Structure 1
């Protein structure tokens, strides 16, 4: 049976349920069969590396895959590439450095541009504030992590190009609704003239909308989030959170199957020296 296979992170998370449907749907259009696999828990690094390994011994033309960690699947993917399997990295980037040393490569990496995500949620505040503008802040995530710092850049640059906006306080905050509430109230005392605050995660965001529920500024103050969890989504339907910048799972999976099928057609796997393709998929701004 099937000519293509897709390993994902898990399927108890709606994010990955939406990705599966996008690869299936996109398959029915291209004329290719697909088998979608995943290991139960988000922290099953070994159980996914066993999964992938089992698939490698079957006869799949190509295999797209979302790695739990950046190095848990380097040896199976590099093996897969020597056999001539058309691999396509999804969501998070696999350690290319390690992969090089493994003697392998990938046809393409398909992810969401985290900087654009930050500018998308900052730009939403900009337009809502209007000409008048006003003061804003960015509750950052934890330092060292690229994915939250990327949202930190984009959101910063987008408010600097708006010469009617005042960035009061972009300060660190580890991914925590409690610690997000505590630095929230800190900015609301230092600068109580704030009209909105974008947060670099949906966890922090509900902790900042708690600091606005405190001072009972709910309505004037605009909270924004990222990732778009099912929880916060509801919030935004109820007027409790202003908005959140979700990803596009379905398009990431569908684009990933498209690039895999395109490499197969070519009849030759990407050279080692050749860098992979790099498609970014647009983020979505979920609003009332």
Structure 2
């Protein structure tokens, strides 16, 4: 049989890299993998419906990145009861809710997202120096576990830092236009803002455009997360200050490998057993300076 992967979306580069990484790993393992996302973008109910349709196609295993912590709880529990080998990718499902629903997953593969936020905020703190300044966080969608961890890690770092004042922490729901809108509002209400940490690059690129439109490119630091090509290009060009790169290809490849390796014991993970927890490294991408 084959394996299935349900991602948040296939239109955005972070997730496209994850799909490509899954396929590269499938090519090394010699397994067949179908990778999907639901047509309605960001629709948690559409993604549930997609998951439910796949869970009835006799896949050996399904890896999934849920759009929210709760939207896939019931169909994941249902698949576990059917003996499906399940791997949570990237964004943490509500595991206590999953257990209450009667299910489990073999593994969760993710980035240390508290560390991501701490790195993004930490680089801002380093770049602002002793004088510090007003900073803001553009959050992902409220309640998404990975985004929440980044907000926590950044907020904690900013709170401890001398002369840093976090003046705004606001969701833009992983959306570039909405992040441009939120950044425009922050720039209007906080004309002394010195830096904005953004929970992903889709948002950071919108923020960078708001900063440019305000004539403030280089005057307001903009840090993203994911490391998508356009953000790495923005960092090179000075349009973004940095981005905390993730490795979506490795997240996907590792999740597929865990799903394949899980079947060797001939049974899905017991209900009372803790899933595997596999961290994939992040890396701060800054403007490459070799000039003394």
The reply to whether TM is greater than 0.5 is yes
Give the secondary structure class of the aligned counterpart of 1:178: helix
Counterparts of residues 132-211 of structure 1 (less than 5 Å)? 133-141=130-138, 145=143, 147-158=146-157, 165-175=162-172, 176-189=179-192, 194=194, 196-200=195-199, 202=201, 203=203, 206-207=206-207, 210-211=210-211
Q: Paired residue for 1:281?
A: 280
Larger radius of gyration: 1
Q: Paired residue for 2:119?
A: 120
Provide closer, same or farther for how the CA distance between residues 180 and 201 of structure 1 changes in structure 2, counting only shifts above 3 A.
farther
Does the CA-based 8 Å contact 2:26-2:32 persist in structure 1? Answer: yes
Provide closer, same or farther for how the CA distance between residues 55 and 200 of structure 1 changes in structure 2, counting only shifts above 3 A.
closer
Distance in 2, matches of 1:161 and 1:75, equals 40
Q: Paired residue for 2:290?
A: none
Distance in 1, matches of 2:220 and 2:34, equals 46
Provide closer, same or farther for how the CA distance between residues 262 and 209 of structure 1 changes in structure 2, counting only shifts above 3 A.
same
Q: Paired residue for 2:99?
A: 100
Does the CA-based 8 Å contact 2:137-2:196 persist in structure 1? Answer: no
Gap regions ≥5 residues in structure 2: 173-178, 288-292
Distance in 2, matches of 1:38 and 1:207, equals 26
Give the secondary structure class of the aligned counterpart of 1:63: strand
Does the CA-based 8 Å contact 1:64-1:89 persist in structure 2? Answer: yes
Q: Paired residue for 1:239?
A: 238
Distance in 2, matches of 1:42 and 1:90, equals 18
Gap regions ≥5 residues in structure 1: none
Distance in 2, matches of 1:221 and 1:70, equals 33
- Greater mean alpha carbon deviation, residues 44-53 or residues 116-125: 44-53
Give the secondary structure class of the aligned counterpart of 2:252: helix
Size of the alignment, in residue pairs?
278
Provide closer, same or farther for how the CA distance between residues 260 and 242 of structure 1 changes in structure 2, counting only shifts above 3 A.
same
Distance in 2, matches of 1:173 and 1:204, equals 13
Distance in 2, matches of 1:48 and 1:220, equals 40
- TM-score normalised according to structure 1 size: 0.80
- TM-score normalised according to structure 2 size: 0.79
Does the CA-based 8 Å contact 2:208-2:239 persist in structure 1? Answer: no
Cα deviations across residues 43-80 of structure 1 (Å, max 9, x unaligned)? 34343333322322333221111223333333332222
Does the CA-based 8 Å contact 1:62-1:260 persist in structure 2? Answer: yes
Does the CA-based 8 Å contact 1:212-1:221 persist in structure 2? Answer: no
Does the CA-based 8 Å contact 2:8-2:65 persist in structure 1? Answer: yes
Does the CA-based 8 Å contact 1:66-1:91 persist in structure 2? Answer: yes
Give the secondary structure class of the aligned counterpart of 1:72: coil
Q: Paired residue for 1:53?
A: 52
Q: Paired residue for 2:80?
A: 81
Cα deviation, residue 230, structure 1? 6.1
Cα deviation, residue 135, structure 1? 0.8
Distance in 2, matches of 1:262 and 1:201, equals 31
Cα deviations across residues 195-224 of structure 1 (Å, max 9, x unaligned)? x4434455367447745764x564455332
Cα deviations across residues 105-130 of structure 1 (Å, max 9, x unaligned)? 1111122232111111123234545x
